[PDB]
Amino acid sequence: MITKVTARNNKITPVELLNQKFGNKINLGNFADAVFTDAAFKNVAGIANLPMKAPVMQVLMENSIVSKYLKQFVPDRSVSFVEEGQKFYIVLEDGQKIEVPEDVNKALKATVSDVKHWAGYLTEDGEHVIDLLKPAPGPHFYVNLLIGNRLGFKRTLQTTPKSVVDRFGRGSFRSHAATQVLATRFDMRQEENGFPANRQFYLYEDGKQIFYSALIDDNIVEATSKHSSNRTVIKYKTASNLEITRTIFLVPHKKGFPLATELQRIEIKNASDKARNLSITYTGMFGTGAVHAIFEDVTYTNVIMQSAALYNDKGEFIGITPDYYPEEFKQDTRFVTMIVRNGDEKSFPQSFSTDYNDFVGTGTLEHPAGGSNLNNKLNRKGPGFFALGAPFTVEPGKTVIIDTFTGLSSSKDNENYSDAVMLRELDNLLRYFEKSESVEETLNEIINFHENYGKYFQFNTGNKLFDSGFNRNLAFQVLYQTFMSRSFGQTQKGYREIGFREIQDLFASMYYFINIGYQDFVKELLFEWTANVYKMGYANHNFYWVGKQPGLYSDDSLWLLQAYYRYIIYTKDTSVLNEEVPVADGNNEKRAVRETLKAIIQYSASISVGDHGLPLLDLADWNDSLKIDSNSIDGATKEKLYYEQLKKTNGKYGDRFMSDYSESVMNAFLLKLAIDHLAEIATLDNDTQLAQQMSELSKEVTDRIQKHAWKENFFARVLINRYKDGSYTYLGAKGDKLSADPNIDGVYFLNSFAWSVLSDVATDEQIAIMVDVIKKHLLTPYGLRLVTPADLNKIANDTATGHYFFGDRENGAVFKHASMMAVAALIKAAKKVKDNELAKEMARIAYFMIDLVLPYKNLENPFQVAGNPRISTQYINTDTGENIGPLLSGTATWLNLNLISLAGIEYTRDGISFNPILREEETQLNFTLKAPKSSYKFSITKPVGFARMESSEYELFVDGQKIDNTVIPMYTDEKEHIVTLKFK
Amino acid sequence: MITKVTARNNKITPVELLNQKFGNKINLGNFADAVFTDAAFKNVAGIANLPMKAPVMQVLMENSIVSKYLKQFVPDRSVSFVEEGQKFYIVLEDGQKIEVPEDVNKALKATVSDVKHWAGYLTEDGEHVIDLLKPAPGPHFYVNLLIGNRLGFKRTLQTTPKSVVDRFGRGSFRSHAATQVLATRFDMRQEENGFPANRQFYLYEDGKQIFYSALIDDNIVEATSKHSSNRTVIKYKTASNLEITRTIFLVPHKKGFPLATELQRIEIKNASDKARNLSITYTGMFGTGAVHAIFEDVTYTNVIMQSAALYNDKGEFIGITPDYYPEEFKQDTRFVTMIVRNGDEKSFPQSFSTDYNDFVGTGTLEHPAGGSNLNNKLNRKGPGFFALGAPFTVEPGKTVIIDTFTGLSSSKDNENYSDAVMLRELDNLLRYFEKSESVEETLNEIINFHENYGKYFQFNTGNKLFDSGFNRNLAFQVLYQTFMSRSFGQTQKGYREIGFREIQDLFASMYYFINIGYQDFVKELLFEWTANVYKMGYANHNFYWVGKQPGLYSDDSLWLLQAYYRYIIYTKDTSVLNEEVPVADGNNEKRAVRETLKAIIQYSASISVGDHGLPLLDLADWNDSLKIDSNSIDGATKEKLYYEQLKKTNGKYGDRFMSDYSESVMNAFLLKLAIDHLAEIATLDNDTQLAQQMSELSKEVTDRIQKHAWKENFFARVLINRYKDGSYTYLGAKGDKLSADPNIDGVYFLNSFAWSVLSDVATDEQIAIMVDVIKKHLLTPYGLRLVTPADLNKIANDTATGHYFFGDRENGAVFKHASMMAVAALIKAAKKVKDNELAKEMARIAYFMIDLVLPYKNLENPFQVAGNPRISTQYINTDTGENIGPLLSGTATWLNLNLISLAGIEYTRDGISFNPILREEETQLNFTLKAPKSSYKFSITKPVGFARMESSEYELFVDGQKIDNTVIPMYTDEKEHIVTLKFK
C-alpha cells in the first residue's frame, strides 16, 4: 500500500533532473542549482551556470518577486533561469525562452552577483569575514573558539576558561571542567550550543525596540562578523545610521581576578546628524550548577537557586549573581556586570530583570514585551536569566561604549572559599577595567601573545591563505587543544575529561611553548601525565582532577614516550628523567621518571603480551572499536591476577602474563618506537646500561613483528590467539578471512601502515606493497579511509560498524586524524626510501591528503565540503565530501607536524636533520624557525618536478659556507643563521 | 566593597513600600500591585484596590501610553494609580492628585477591568478557559495531560500513549516507556516541555505569512484555549475574520492501528465576504531515539538518521518518517501525515521541508523565511524536523478542515517488526479516518468513555466547581496516574519506571475500572505487581518491562496488601488468592498469591526485623530521605547473608535476621495494617488457620509498637539500635534529642501520626496528644507539613535540609500527598473516637487541608497560589503559598479516597459501613454511587454544626425502611437503592 523513499534512496537529484530536461537546450555550466517543485519530485525549478555550488534557488524562493513570478509556471512546469548578456530569461521544457520582467531580472542579478563569497571570505591574516544574512554550509562553519590564559598560575590545564562563539555571538562559556558560566544548550540541533539569549542585547528609542543583536531585518543595512585569533567582532549598521560593534574575548588571568571572565564590549556610534535618546537591555542565561538535573529534575534546578543583586561602595547597582542553597553548588559563584561609558561619565545599570517570563511577556525573545521596562524583581527561583538596562543619549558623530563582564569565581583557585571571595575578585576586575582604554589594551595583549606564540615556525610562501592558515590559525588551534583536549566546542558539550592519549596535542605545541619561555609548563604537563602511570607500566585512560580507568586501554602509556622523546631531544634536558613523580597507585609513593619509562616498556614488551610476544590488545587500543576480546580486563584486574599467577607457577616479576588474549600490532609499533625513543634518551643521558638494553630489546620486538605480523601484503592489525585450530589467527591483511567486501581479500587498516613506518619497522619493499594496497582500497577521492569493510562479528560480539550510514565516522569515513598519521608515515618514507618513484608517489598522496584537510581550502567549494575555514574538523563524509565536526581533532596536531616535516625539519640528538620534500610544482619554499637560543631563515629552491636529497643533486649552505652534513647544528649563539638549499 | 542582596534577603517588597508611602493618603484596599522603579529599590510605581493579587503593573508597563506617561514621574518619584468614580488619578508622595489624561485613563480602565479572570475561568463542567495573552501564575497552571486507551490490548500499562499540552499546544507526546514521538526539550525553563515547533502551524495568503499558531500579534483579535477531559481546543479570530480552531487528542487504540497516534484537527472558517486563497504549513520535531546522545553526542543523533517520504497507493505524497540506521532505533517507526478537506475534495500535502535551517532561513521560527515555499528536500541527516504544506481556497462562510496524524508504530506490539509494519498500520489508520465525521465521532467516543468512567461516584452539591472538579477532573487524573505513575508531565520528563509503591494509585482507581467492566484489568495489575515480589517477601523497588532494585526499600511489598485488601473486600473475589504467579526470583517458578502475601508479612514481621521486633528501615522506607543507616543492604544481599547466618547458628527459616540496623515505625504500621488485611481476607476465604494466625500476629505486632515505639509525645518514626549506651535510641517524638529547632523538643513526622491511625494502633488518648502536637508544630497557614526541623547529622548527616530554601520540598514544605494521608487518618479517627470535640477538631483540620489541595480553588487567588485548577500539584511552598509542580502526585489518589470517605463510604466484609462527616456549615450532602450489580442514591441532611453518628441523633432509611444497622448491604439486585440519613 504505502511506500517509503529515504533521502539516500531517492532516485534522482534536482540538478540531475534539471540537466535531463534542459542540459541540451541551454548551457547549464559547471555548477547549477535546482529544487523539486512538488513532493513527488516530478518537476524542477533551477538556475544555470553558477560560479560554485550554492543554495541559490532557496534564496530566490525567499524573494517575494521571484517567488510570485515562478508560480506562473511551477509546480506543473519545470523551468530553468539562464543569463544571456546581462539579462535573465526563464526557459521551459517546450523550448520557450522568456525574457523575465525587469523587477525579476533585477532580483535574480542581485542574488547571483556575489555567490562566490556567500560563505564569507578570509582576510590576508586568515580572519573569516561572514555575512550575517547568508546561509551556513554547516553547523561548524561559522564558529570561533576562545580561550583564556592561566600560564603562570595554578592548575593551568584544569582552570583555563573557554568559549564558543558563532557569527551572531551565540554559544556558551565555561570555567574549569564542564562548569558553565553562560548556559549550554543540549537540544536537537547541532547549531544550538547555548541558551539563545546568551551575549545578546536590545536597543530602545522612545520606548520602542529598534535593534536586537540576533535579528537582522529590513532596518539592518549592513551586518558582518569577523572571527579572528581569540576574539570575534560583529558589526551592524542600521537604516537610521547607528553603527554597532560587538567585541568578544576572554580575559587573560591576573592575580586577584575571578577564575573566568568573558568581556563583551558594545560600541554604539551615532552616525546621523541628530542626537538619539537610547537605552540598552543586555541579556544572558547563567548555566546551572546542577547540570544532570536538567534531564532528571528541571524543577530542582529552579528551586535550588535565586537571583541576587550586587551593589558597589556607593550603593549603586552593578549586576546580578545567581545564589545557590546547596553547598555543592556554592563552590563556584557567577556574576554579570556592565559599565556604560558616555563621554566623561561612567554609569552602571539603572534597572534589571531576572525572570524570563516577565521579560518576554506576551512577546518573543526577538521582540520581548518587557524588554524596555525591566521590573527590578529578584527572582526567588532559577533559571538565572538576566537583563541589565541603562539609558544613554549619544550625540551626532559620538560613540557610547558598554563594557560587559560575565564570569565565575571558584574554590578551585581559592582556599576558604565563599561568595565573599567572588565579591573581592569582581572588585579587582572592575577596578582593573575602570579606564576605557584598559579593554583595548588587554585585547592588544591577547593579539600580541598569539602573534608572538606563532613565531616558532613561520611559512613565507606568498600564498597568504596558506601562510595565515598555518602560522596563525593552526598554531592557535593546537594551543587550544593542548588545554582543552577534545572537551569543548560547538557540538562537544558533555563531560569529557582529558584522555591519556591526547598527550598527542603536546607533540606539536611543546615547541611553541618552549620558544616563548614556558619550558617549565611543558615539563609540568609531562610530569602530570607521568603521574597517571602505575608502577607496573599501564596508565589511567582518563584524568582531570583525578585519574581513572586503570590500564583500561592498551596503547595509552606508550604515547608518553613520544612526548618525552620530543621534549628530551629538543631541549637536551635529561634532568626530567630524575624527577620523583607520584605513581598512580597512590599511598604517597613516587618513582623517578626514568624508572616509570622503563616500566611502561616492560608492561607492553614482557608482561602484557600474547602468544607472539606482542602487546595485548585488552578492551581496545587507539582504535575505539576493536573490541575483539569480550572478556578483557583492565590493568588492576590483570595486576592482582598476574601476581597470583606468579605464585601459582613460582615465576618472577617480568614474566609473561599467560593468556589467550589477542595482540595489537599497532601497540607493537608504538612499543618499538617507544623503545628506540628510550634508547636515544639514555644515550643523550650517557646511561650506558639503559641504551644497550633498549637497543637490544628493539631488535627483539622488531623480530617479533616481522616474524609474526607481516601477513602476505600488509602488516596485520590484530593477532588472534584463541582458536588453536587456526580458524582465525589474524586481522588486517590478505587472507585474514575477515573482509566484508566481496571484491576485497583481507581487511586493511590505514594505521597498520602508518605505525609500521613511523616506528621504522617496515622495509622499503613492505612499504611498496602496502602503498599499492592503499592506492587500490583506502585512497578515495576525499582522502585516505581508516579501514576497509570488515565482518568482525565472525570473532566478536558486534556493536561497532552497526551505527552509521555509509560515509560517516566508522562506516568508511575519512577520519582526518588517522589520515594525518598516515601522511606522517608517507612523508617519513618519502625522505628515505631508495626508489625515487615510490618516494614521488607517496609525497603525491601526502599532499593530496593535506589539501583535503587544510581548513582554508574549505572556502573553495564551501556548500559541498562545509567544515570551517579556520579550524580543523574531525572527518570527511566519503559519500558527499562534507567535512563534519567536531572542531577539535588530532587532525590539527598532526597536520602541524606534517607540514613542518615536509618543510624538512626533524630534531635529532645531533641537531636538525634537514630533508625537505617540496611540491612538484613549487620552485621555492621559505620559512623562519625559532630555537631557544638561536633562529634560522630557510630557503629552498628547485626546478619544477620532484626533488629530494636522497635522489637529487643539491648544494647546501649554512651561513654562506657550503657544507656536507645535512644535520644542521642546534645553535645557541643567539644569532640568526641563513640556511639555503638548491636542487639541480 | 561590593555587597550582595538575595531575593529572600531583600528587606522590603514593592507593595510594602507602596503602603509605607501611600497607605494613609489613599485607600490601597485589600490587594494592590507595585514594582520598584530602579535597581536600588528606593521608589515604587503601584496601583490601588485590585480585586486580587495580579501582575497589573507588569501589563501596564507593556502599554506604550501608560509607560510613556509614567516616565514623567518615575524613576525619581514614587507614584500610585487610584480610581475614583470611573476615573483614574495618579498620586505622588507630596500629595498631588492628578487626573490622568483620557488616553491613560482608558488604558488603565481597560487593564483592570477583568483582573478577576486574568488566570482564566472554569466552565460548569470544570474545563479551564484560558486567554492566550494573559500572564501565567506558574509553569504548571495552563497545562493539560492527555492519555490514549489500550484497554483490551496487550501490555496496557506499558503501551498507553500520553501527551502534554499547554494553552498554545506546546509540549510533547510519548509512546511506550519514555519513547518520544514529538521531541521533549530538556533545557533551562520548566515552561519548555517540548521542541518549540511541536503542533504548530502557519497560514499564508498571496505568499505572505498571516498567522502562526504560537504568535499572538495585533492581527489576532480573539485567542482562547480550553483544557477539557482528555482534549484541548484552541480558538483564534483574525482581524481579517478568519476563525481558526485546533483540537488535540490521542487516538484510542483499535486493532491494526499504530501503537501511538496524536490527532490534531485544524478548522479554518472564512467568516468574511470574500474567498481567500490560503496555504498551511504544518510543523513539528520528531523525538530522537538516541535520547542519551542529546547530552553526550548531538552530532550522533543527527547522522544516525535521515528523513524519508511516504506515498500512498496513487503515488501521492502523504507525509514524513524519520529513518534510522542503527537496529536499536529501528524497533519504533515514527510518522506524520495530513489530510486537507475542502468541501468534498480531500487532498494530501503538496510540499514539504525536513531541514530546520532551510525552513527558518534568515528569519525566525515565529516568522520563517522558507515557510511558504517548502523545498521538497529530504534531509540526509537529523534532526527530524518536518513542515508539510498544502494550498486551499476557502469561500465566504465556508470551513476547511486539516486533520493531522502524528505517531509511532512499534515492535512492542508486533512480532517480526520492521518499518513495513508501520506502513500497514498507518494505512489502517488513514482508512479509518477517511470520512470527515470519523474524527468527531472518535472525540465523542473519548468524551463518553470518561463520562461513563466517572459514574462510579458523583457528588451533586450546590457547587458545580466542586462537583466537576471531583466527578470529572479528579476522576481523570487518578485514571491518568494509574497508567503513568509519576513518569510524564510538564516537568516530569526523564526516565521513570513504575515504582512498586505507586500501586497506591490503584487504591482509588480500581473501583472506577471495576464499574465499567474492567475487573480483569485490575486483577492483571495486581498480578503484575505480585510478580515483582520475591520468595522471601521483599520487592523490586521498580519495574517497567522487568523489575529491579530487589528489597532496596523496606516498605514496598507491604503496600500490596492494601491493594489486595481493597480488591478482595470490594469484589469478594478471593479466587485471586489461588492464582499461580511468577516469583521475581525468576528461573521458571510461580507461587500462589496466598503464599506470596503470607511471605510479605513474614519478611517484615519475623525476618527483616530489628531489636524490637519491628521491620528494619534498610536504605529507606516510604520517606525518600531517611538514609539513617549508611551500610544498609537490599534484600538479595540480606538473603545471601541470612542463610549463612542460619547455617552458622543452626537456625531455621523464619528466624530473625540478626543485626543492629534501625527499625521503621512507619513500616510497623504498614505491616500491622497488612496483617489485619490478610486476616480479613482469609476470613472471607473461610481459611480458618490463616485468619487465626494473622489475628494473633497482629496483637503481637501491636504490642511491639505500643511497648517500644510510643515515646511520651508521639509514635516515633525510627528506632535506633546501634548505640548500646543509649546515646540515641529513637527519632520522632519528644526526647529523641534530634530536633534542630530551638523551640521544639523532638522531631515529629506527620506520617507517624497518620499511619498509627490508619493501622488502628493508636488509642483515643494517643490520638489526642498527637493532634495537639500537630496543631502546635505541623499545622501551618498553608496546611500540614511533613516533618519538623531535624538535625540528622547527629547520627548520619547528608541531604534534603541540605538542598532547599525554607519552604520547598524537604526543607519544610506542605507535601500534599503526605498531607492527604494525614487527612485520611483524621477522617478515620473523627468517625470513631469517643470525644466528640476531638472528632470535631480533627474534621476541621481535615477540611482545612482538603480546601488547600482542591485544584479548582487555585483560581481563588491564582497569582499567589498558582498550581493548576484542574490537576493537583505536588507541594505547597510554606514561605509563599505557591502550589508547585509536578502535576502527578499521590495527592490526587488520596484526595479522592478522602472525599469519598468523608461522604461516608467504607467497604467492609459485610458491605458499606456508612458514616459520613459533613462540613459544619453544610445542611445537606447528596451523591450517587455505582456498584457492580446495583446503584445507590445517598442523601444526608443535618442542622448547621458538627454532626456524626457516634455522637449525634440520627435516623437512617434504606429503600423507605428505617434501619439500625449502619452497614448497608452490597446489593446485587440490579436496582437503584435510596439511602437517607437525617441528623437531629
Ligand SMILES: OC[C@H]1O[C@@H](O)[C@H](O)[C@@H](O)[C@@H]1O
Ligand atoms: O577514531 C577514534 C578517535 O576519534 C574520537 O573518538 C576521539 O576524539 C579520539 O580520541 C579517537 O582516537
Ligand SMILES: OC[C@H]1O[C@@H](O)[C@H](O)[C@@H](O)[C@@H]1O
Ligand atoms: O516524599 C517523597 C515522595 O515524593 C516524590 O519523591 C515521589 O514522587 C514519591 O514517590 C515519594 O513518595
Ligand SMILES: [Cl-]
Ligand atoms: Cl586503527
Ligand SMILES: [Cl-]
Ligand atoms: Cl565542536
Ligand SMILES: [Cl-]
Ligand atoms: Cl508535571
Ligand SMILES: [Cl-]
Ligand atoms: Cl515519613
